[PDB]
Amino acid sequence: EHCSHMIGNGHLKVLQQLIDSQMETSCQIAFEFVDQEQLDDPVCYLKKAFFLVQDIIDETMRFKDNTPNANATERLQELSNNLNSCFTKDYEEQNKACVRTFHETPLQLLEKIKNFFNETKNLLEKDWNIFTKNCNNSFAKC
């Protein structure tokens, strides 16, 4: 039941600060994320996104040790670990399904993360059991 309030605005604020502090550039990086074209259902979209966000946070969002943003990323990683208990397992078949390679700006990637945490937060507040949902169909459609 604690999943309702696991995500705090302190986290979204630290995330947004992190976003704003990044320098705007043209350079594009490659990363795996959810293909909206094949998966539109909000709940299942977020459900799938969660694990991809875990990985991106782990291997992509790198900062110099002990920098405010480095600690921000630590907080978010911990948050992700606590959130593990709020998402139910679906199937292993679907991992790497509904997923595409994206070549975009770091800013756009961080925006995707922000949207995830925000919408995830809202839906959890509305119904902390929302992510027990079975999405095998939504995933298979892709």
Binding site: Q28, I29, A30, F31, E59, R62, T101, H103
Partner: protein, 186 residues
């Protein structure tokens, strides 16, 4: 991925960790039949070298963590599977991509009348040149130097000629029609 004959096409691979780019020893391969591996070219610290056979047909370039294999101009031979091996120290990752080349079908119709015993039998010919899977059919196989495939069917019509007559040509999902309407004389 898919591309048409002659067009420029780009297959992609990347390193999981975004921090690294030049450090990775990238190497691309052409998977010939029998899971054979033909070295196309290599890259390291932005030093690229394409093997002479593929020189001018393929190129490799980088941006950040992303690695691109560029086919300057796709020809039928290129259709198949490609493999990218990326190495950092002892660790290495392999990514696989499938390039389907396509040649837009070319349907052609043309007729001729019998020269013996009379000039009453009009025979029409329907011809489709495409790739990878051409198909021709009347509504009642040769290999080309370009590497494409030509196939054709003939239909005989005794007088009176029951025109118009239609033939259907298609390349998998692509499709087109040819219709002979009238002769010069009748």
């Amino acid at each position: 991925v898919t591309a048409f004959l002659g067009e420029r096409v780009t297959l992609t691979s990347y390193w999981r960790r975004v921090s690294l780019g030049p450090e990775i020893e990238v190497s691309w391969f052409k998977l010939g039949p029998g899971e054979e591996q033909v070295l196309i070219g290599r890259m390291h610290h932005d030093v690229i070298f394409i093997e002479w056979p593929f020189r001018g047909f393929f190129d490799i370039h980088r941006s950040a963590n992303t690695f691109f294999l560029v086919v300057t101009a796709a020809n039928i031979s290129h259709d198949g599977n490609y493999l990218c091996r990326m190495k950092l120290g002892e660790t290495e990752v392999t990514k696989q991509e499938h390039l389907s080349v396509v040649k837009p079908l070319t349907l052609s119709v043309h007729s001729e009348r019998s020269q013996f015993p009379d000039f009453s039998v009009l025979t029409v010919t329907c011809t489709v040149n495409a790739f990878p899977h051409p198909h021709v059919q009347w509504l009642m196989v040769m290999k080309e130097k370009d590497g494409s495939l030509s196939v054709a069917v003939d239909l005989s019509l005794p007088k009176p000629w029951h025109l118009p007559v239609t033939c259907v040509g298609k390349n998998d999902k692509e499709e087109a029609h040819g219709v002979y309407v009238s002769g010069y004389l009748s």
